[PDB]
Structures are given as structure tokens and as C-alpha cells.
Amino acid sequence: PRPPAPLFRDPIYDGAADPTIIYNHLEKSWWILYTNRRANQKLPGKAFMHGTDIGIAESKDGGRTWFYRGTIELQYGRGRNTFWAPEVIFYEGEYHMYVSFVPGVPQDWNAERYILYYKSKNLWDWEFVCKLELSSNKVIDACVFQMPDGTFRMWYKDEADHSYIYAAESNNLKDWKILGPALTDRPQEGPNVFWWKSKYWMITDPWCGLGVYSSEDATAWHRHENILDRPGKREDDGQIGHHADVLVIDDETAYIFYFTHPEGMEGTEEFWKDSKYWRTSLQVAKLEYVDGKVVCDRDKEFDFYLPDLF
Ligand SMILES: [Ca+2]
Ligand SMILES: [Mg+2]
């Protein structure tokens, strides 16, 4: 059947955003990990975006039904801090998380941002490995893809360099070498790289729907039309899509997980003055390949199924 719409709302703060989907091999279930903004609280300034943990949504029926399981509450030093937009990959029997960190609970954008590396055997329990040394101390929104020579490539947003997408590389998943700016066409965030239809694709969030790029080498990018830039008809899908994660099932089947601010009015003073605008909803849509380009009709019915990985 068609996926649920919305796919999922967080039942603690209703601030589900920046979804990353990961198969839980031990419990044989699909997990979505998400930034949980404190969206249903009456808070000063931009506080609702901060003091965040990672929420867990689980499906045992291939994504037809989702249930909140709880939080991943990470620690980096002392106090109440901010955790954003985890990347999680399974590799050599372990889960590898690249999570964005903001010190304390800011009420504005006047703070550093780091990417931190945590590891887990079971997706519940995480051990701190290290802080990544990237191009600045204002870096967020890691995504990782393993290249054919075995080297892992990372993309992230550098807010200290015009909010451009940067690339880095690692052979051991711990130590990362800066490759430099990957995209210098526009400020954007939430990079997501995948392989499909014999090409590399990057999805970005330039805040007017999602950017779409293709590459033969995951270095030289060719820009295509945005997706999820027009309102959808489904419940809570009537606004631009944000910060996506792509799951490739097979050569014909790829799903895009994203979030909306369903009440809209982003980019206005009204957004910050009325907490009704703060809530976010997870969504899924099906990617298509038309005239050599990845496209998406968020309104088109499809039979959503997330099979167990064997
Ligand atoms: Ca991401
Ligand atoms: Mg992913």
C-alpha cells in the first residue's frame, strides 16, 4: 500500500527532522533516527532548534506502520548540549554515526558547530570516538558514501565558507582529510550522496525544495532541477521538502525520506514569533529517473515496502 502521510511525527516534542534511515540487523527492524527539535515548547528566540537529542522511529512491517521507541542522548563534555542531523552507516559489524554538535542551548546562531564520530554495536548504546577536524568550527550535516577504491567520502556544510558543501575522505572512518569545496553554486545544507542508474547523485537543501546533482566520479557535479519545491496534496506534505535521506532498494526502487514544516511561513518573522510554525513532519516519496535525471512526484501513489536486508 501507499506510505503513511505524514510518515511520522515525534510524540514528545513534535520536532522530527533531518531523518536518516538504517536497518537494525540485531532486532530485524527499520529505524529512522532524527533531530528532535523542541517544537511544541514556548521558548525564547531560536531555543527550540537547540538542546536537541536524536529520536527513534521503528517499523517491523516494512514501513507501513511506525512507532516511537525513544532517544539517543549523546554526551560531549559537560552540560545540556545540542545534537543535530546524524549520518549512520553500518560497516564491519558496527554502526558509525557522524552527528553535528552545538555547544549548550543557543537562542541564536552565535555558536560553533562540530561533527563528532560515535560508534555502536546495537543502535541503542553509543561510544564517543573523536571530534572531526574539518575546514572550520562551523560544520554540520555529514553524509558518507564508500568510493570504489574503498575510501569513504564525506560531504558537509561549512557555514564559515558561504554555507558551501565541502568534501573530505577517510580510509579508517575516524581520521578525515579535507578535499575542499564540492559545490560553490549556492548556500545549502543536508547533503545526501547515493549511487543509482549508473551515476552518483547528491541531494541538497538550498531552502527552496531540494537540490539535485549528478556525477560520474562524485567530484565533478552537474546541477539538475530541484525536487519537492511545490506543495504536495498529502497530509502535512503541503510545503517544500527539507534535509533528505535516500534509500536505494534496487536498480528500479529508491525512496527519499524528508521533512516539512507543514504550517509553512519559513523565512518570516511570524515563523519565530508563533511556536505553531515550529513543528515538523517526516515524509517519504518515490524517486523516478526521467530523461537522465532523478525527479520526484510527491503526490504519485506507490506501493512502499522496506524489505529485511539479507
Ligand atoms: Ca543528513
Ligand atoms: Mg543515508
Residue numbers in the entry: 2 to 311
What does the study report here?
Functional, biochemical, and preliminary structural properties are reported for three glycoside hydrolases of the recently described glycoside hydrolase (GH) family 159. Even though the thermophilic enzymes investigated—Cs_Gaf159A, Ch_Gaf159A, and Ck_Gaf159A—cleaved pNP-α-l-arabinofuranoside, they were only weakly active on arabinogalactan, and they did not cleave arabinose from arabinan, arabinoxylan, or gum arabic. However, the enzymes were able to hydrolyze the α-1,3-linkage in different arabinoxylan-derived oligosaccharides (AXOS) with arabinosylated xylose at the non-reducing end (A3X, A2,3XX), suggesting their role in the intracellular hydrolysis of oligosaccharides. Like some other glycoside hydrolases, Cs_Gaf159A, Ch_Gaf159A, and Ck_Gaf159A are activated by divalent metal ions.
Crystallization and structural analysis of the apo form of one of the Caldicellulosiruptor enzymes, Ch_Gaf159A, enabled the elucidation of the first 3D structure of a GH159 member. However, Ch_Gaf159A is substantially smaller than its homologues, consisting of only a five-bladed β-propeller domain. Each blade is composed of four mainly antiparallel beta-strands. The stable monomeric state of Ch_Gaf159A was confirmed by means of polymerization-induced self-assembly (PISA) calculations and size-exclusion chromatography. The fold of Ch_Gaf159A displays striking similarities to that of glycoside hydrolase family 43. The positions of E190, D142, and D19 in Ch_Gaf159A exactly matched E186, proposed to be the nucleophilic catalytic base, D127, and D14 in XynB. E190 in Ch_Gaf159A is suggested as being catalytically important given its proximity to the glycosidic O and its description as a catalytic base in XynB. The surface representation showed two electro negative pockets, one of them capable of incorporating the X2 ligand. This substrate pocket structurally explains why Ch_Gaf159A acts as an exo-arabinofuranosidase, or -galactofuranosidase. The complete loss of activity of the Ch_Gaf159A mutants D19A, D142A and E190A, which was tested with pNPA, AXOS and arabinogalactan, confirmed this prediction.
